Design a protein around this nucleic acid. Structure first.
Ligand code: CA
Ligand code: CA
Ligand code: CA
Length: 272
DNA sequence: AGGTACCCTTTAAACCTACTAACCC
DNA sequence: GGTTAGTAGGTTTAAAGGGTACCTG
């Protein structure tokens, strides 16, 4: 387990949070995903050797670091292998807060305000706790290895196969392999950077999310990539089945209609 | 006051199709 | 002509993102 894959992953799916209740303040960071990939959590768990997994919620598993003193291992990991997403801003923010706690400054009705001003500029914002602290606040704060991208893709990627309805092809259809990786429109910073990292691939706008889409000859490049740094999780069946199509469709086998049958079969049994 | 854990709710991620364009020429 | 590609439209869940209560101090 490479130490960048972790950041690459946490950049894509981690969740640094500040909660407030009745005022009790506690910091959490958790990765939440489909139960089928509990083992990936377990891989990560054992890697940091801290935190815990449980069933939040249905057909899912959450993993969480909620002890103060275990969060330090995390924070220590993330400074040396910093993060590239706007999530960064959430860490810096999450981290400052952990400072305040490190000193016990948050037992003061004052520290308590220094923390909400942070919380207010976190993932979503102040909710019911807008009128409690209507004194406002705030001020939120280049790919790194390629193990980052393996991590980033293995969580925020999609390896799918395309059966177009070309009325022109003798089969009446086109097999094509696209690779996708979606992210918020606010991360234009990162998406544009994904393109330059490979010097190829399409950037597209949709529903306020952007997609980095990636020509066979390029499709093959990144195929080579995930030999050098592969995907991890259940999601690497989809890669392999995709990868498989990349062979049985790369010796002119995707043009015979005995083969398209074969492809759909493969495709049919992937993603779902 | 710090754990530790049973829950929850929407939405940004993943996943789909089907037509145009610009390609081997 | 036949194959590619770049595009427009989609659907749906697995995330992206939250809570508060319970022991033990
Ligand atoms: Ca994400
Ligand atoms: Ca994922
Ligand atoms: Ca470039």
């Amino acid at each position: 387990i490479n130490p960048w894959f972790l950041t690459g992953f946490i950049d894509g799916e981690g969740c640094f949070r500040i909660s407030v209740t009745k005022w009790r303040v506690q910091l959490f960071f958790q990765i939440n995903l489909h139960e089928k990939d509990r083992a990936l959590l377990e891989s990560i768990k054992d890697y940091l050797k801290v935190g815990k997994i449980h069933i939040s919620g249905k057909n899912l598993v959450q993993y969480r670091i909620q002890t103060f003193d275990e969060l330090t291992i995390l924070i220590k990991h993330l400074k040396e292998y910093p993060l590239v997403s706007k999530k960064r801003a959430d860490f810096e923010l999450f981290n400052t807060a952990h400072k305040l706690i490190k000193n016990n400054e948050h037992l003061n009705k004052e520290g308590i305000n220094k923390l909400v001003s942070l919380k207010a500029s976190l993932n979503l914002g102040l909710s019911s706790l807008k009128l409690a602290f209507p004194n406002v606040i705030a001020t939120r704060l280049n790919i790194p290895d390629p193990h980052w991208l393996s991590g980033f893709a293995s969580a925020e990627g999609c390896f799918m196969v395309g059966i177009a309805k070309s009325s022109a092809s003798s089969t009446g259809y086109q097999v094509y392999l696209t690779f996708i990786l979606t992210q918020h429109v606010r991360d234009e910073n990162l998406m544009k950077c994904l393109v330059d990292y490979f010097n190829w691939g399409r950037l597209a706008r949709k529903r306020n999310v952007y997609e980095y889409q990636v020509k066979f000859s390029d499709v093959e490049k990144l195929l080579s990539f995930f030999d050098k740094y592969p995907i991890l999780g259940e999601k690497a069946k989809d890669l392999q089945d995709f990868c498989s199509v990349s062979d049985l469709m790369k010796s002119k086998t995707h043009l015979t209609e005995e083969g398209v049958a074969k492809i759909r079969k493969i495709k049919e049994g992937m993603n779902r």
